[PDB]
Amino acid sequence: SDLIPAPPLSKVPLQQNFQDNQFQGKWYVVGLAGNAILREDKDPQKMYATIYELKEDKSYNVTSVLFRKKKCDYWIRTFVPGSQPGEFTLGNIKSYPGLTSYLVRVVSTNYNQHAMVFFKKVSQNREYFAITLYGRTKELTSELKENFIRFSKSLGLPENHIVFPVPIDQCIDG
Ligand SMILES: N[C@H](CO)C(=O)OC[C@@H](N)C(=O)OC[C@H](NC(=O)c1cccc(O)c1O)C(=O)O
Ligand SMILES: [Fe+3]
Question: Which family is annotated?
């Protein structure tokens, strides 16, 4: 119940010329970091997928599919376009008990291989933040992973708060 403080938004770059149409589709979480994320070598974090779908109103339908307790859970929420392109807020925030704020900032992406996305939420008055290294495939170059590690560290996170989920085939394919 001690959190590393969220960084100031100045330390989180924004992906320039964000193309919402090109960001659509399935992304694999090849890297995950955050002040509430901890490496667990006893029971390692399994890889999951997050699928982005533009609706007519240009807001995203965001579905995360995860393999947990031998079934696939489906975490659904809406990302509403924020102050500038590549920046979002959470739609229908009142339906999530405790949530007072939620921010999404796409830091960098080339749209067809990889992406880094910054998340910040204030839940039960506690300020959580996270970065995900998204991949179009389950594997990415060690270079991109090291860059993700360097970015996470630049935001105050030590490497025991930086995990690389293990590739799986259940649920996240198809
Ligand atoms: N189900 C998967 C793990 O199998 C999962 O929820 O991990 C993703 C991660 N973002 C997360 O939700 O874990 C920590 C959790 N959430 C965050 O730290 C978090 C932080 C910033 C933005 C978010 O949407 C978050 O969910 C928490 O508050 O304890
Ligand atoms: Fe979450």
Answer: Belongs to the calycin superfamily. Lipocalin family.
Cβ(134) to ligand 1 under 6 A? Answer: no
Within the chain, strands assigned E span 25-34, 49-54, 60-68, 71-81, 87-90, 99-109, 114-123, 126-135, 162-163
- What does the domain layout of the chain look like in residue ranges? 1-174
Report the top-level CATH class of 1-174: mainly beta
d(CA 158, CA 155): 9
Using a 6 Å cutoff on CB, does residue 66 contact ligand 1? Answer: yes
Cβ of 128 closer than 6 Å to ligand 1, yes or no, is: yes
Header resolution in angstroms: 2.6
Cα of 80 from ligand 2 centre, angstroms: 15
